[PDB]
Design a protein around this nucleic acid. Structure first.
Ligand SMILES: CC(C)(P(=O)(O)O)P(=O)(O)OP(=O)(O)OC[C@H]1O[C@@H](n2cnc3c(=O)[nH]c(N)nc32)C[C@@H]1O
Ligand SMILES: [Cl-]
Ligand SMILES: [Cl-]
Ligand SMILES: [Cl-]
Ligand SMILES: [Mg+2]
Ligand code: NA
Ligand code: NA
Ligand code: NA
Length: 326
DNA sequence: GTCGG
DNA sequence: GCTGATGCGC
DNA sequence: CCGACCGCGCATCAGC
């Protein structure tokens, strides 16, 4: 929050480029600048000082000078007045509605919360649930609640098969005091990069979590990735808890470290680490770290037995999860 | 929008 | 039905 | 300059 004013601006500009402009790289350009500045241990005095950080160029430098002087950005002042941009930004806040669908809904006259609600028929399944829990999904989850959720998920998984290992990742693993949702990495001895000795491994877990009324809805579900909704149980006479988004990723047991690296994030940290990797001649995904041949084709997986091994391959000193929140 | 070759 | 490309999300 | 910008699971559609 040291340069919160500036970081909020950039994030607003990022969201604009992504939602309205559908300009993915401009979106990432702004988020990275915001990330880099949020990490800067000094209260930025000028755009010149900002431009020294990597990710901040000449354009963002001008904007930062304007913000510091007026306390705002004209470009944003106008954007907030443009009804189309405002409508598109709003709609995109519903899970399942992206830049394209948002713009299309607007063309059709579907622009508000009320509109969406009276037009459920025009929404696929995911959007339908996103609208259903529109309010809850914007609420934060206190670490205390994440802890209760962790307990339920681990114990229920333990009941299905004592050999399952569920690891809560995301901002939780990074030590945050509150998370936007719950991310669960899951492994089972039967599922390795070598073979799937048992079917429905993920399905069985989902089923059990639904059986105890923890998982309440499903946005999407496949053999290895579940995207849905969950809710902590409330006590007698106690108001129930908000519904929460939950992601469960089944990953080959032998590829745990690359998997937990991926799922721990942050997303920008991942983007930065993978980029640095390429420069170092390696390619990283949630399954493996491979070398880049002369041509450019990925080689065979390199041996990995800890997250640190991955860091070593790219010549980066290890960074604990708590320090990966970029 | 920013960066590196 | 399939594969491949596009949305959307992590 | 100007090309690259991480990598992938699932839902959905076009074309066959
Ligand atoms: C701060 C959070 C948004 P929250 O607390 O508000 O939930 P989070 O938990 O950090 O991220 P979230 O739940 O969206 O995705 C989980 C992880 O998936 C990885 N991940 C997400 N997006 C990407 C991406 O674009 N690329 C890669 N490689 N990994 C990603 C890194 C992410 O950490
Ligand atoms: Cl772009
Ligand atoms: Cl691994
Ligand atoms: Cl791979
Ligand atoms: Mg999360
Ligand atoms: Na810079
Ligand atoms: Na959305
Ligand atoms: Na998530």
């Amino acid at each position: 929050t040291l340069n919160g004013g500036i970081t909020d601006m950039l994030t607003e500009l990022a969201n604009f480029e992504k939602n309205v402009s559908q300009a993915i790289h401009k979106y990432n350009a702004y988020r990275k600048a915001a990330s880099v500045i949020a990490k800067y241990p000094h209260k930025i005095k000028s755009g010149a000082e900002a431009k020294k950080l990597p990710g901040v160029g000449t354009k963002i430098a001008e904007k930062i000078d304007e913000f510091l002087a007026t306390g705002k950005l004209r470009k944003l002042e106008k954007i907030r007045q443009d009804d189309t941009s405002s409508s598109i930004n709003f709609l995109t806040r519903v899970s399942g509605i992206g830049p394209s669908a948002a713009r299309k809904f607007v063309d059709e006259g579907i622009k508000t919360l009320e509109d969406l609600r009276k037009n459920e028929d025009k929404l696929n399944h995911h959007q339908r649930i996103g609208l259903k829990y529109f309010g809850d999904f914007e609420k934060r989850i206190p670490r205390e609640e994440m802890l209760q959720m962790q307990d339920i998920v681990l114990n229920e998984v333990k009941k299905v098969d004592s050999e399952y290992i569920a690891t809560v990742c995301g901002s939780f693993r990074r030590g945050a005091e509150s998370s936007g949702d719950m991310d669960v990495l899951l492994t089972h001895p039967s599922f390795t990069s070598e073979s799937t000795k048992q079917p429905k491994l993920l399905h069985q877990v989902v089923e059990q979590l639904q059986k105890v009324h923890f998982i309440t809805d499903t946005l999407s579900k496949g053999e290895t990735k579940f995207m849905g909704v969950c809710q902590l149980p409330s006590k007698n006479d106690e108001k129930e808890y908000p519904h929460r988004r939950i992601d469960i990723r089944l990953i080959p047991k032998d590829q745990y470290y690359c998997g937990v690296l991926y799922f721990t994030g942050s997303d920008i940290f991942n983007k930065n680490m993978r980029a640095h990797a390429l420069e170092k001649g390696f390619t990283i995904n949630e399954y493996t770290i491979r070398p880049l041949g002369v041509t450019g084709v990925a080689g065979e997986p390199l041996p990995v037995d800890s997250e640190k091994d991955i860091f070593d391959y790219i010549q980066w000193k290890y960074r604990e999860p708590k320090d990966r929140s970029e």
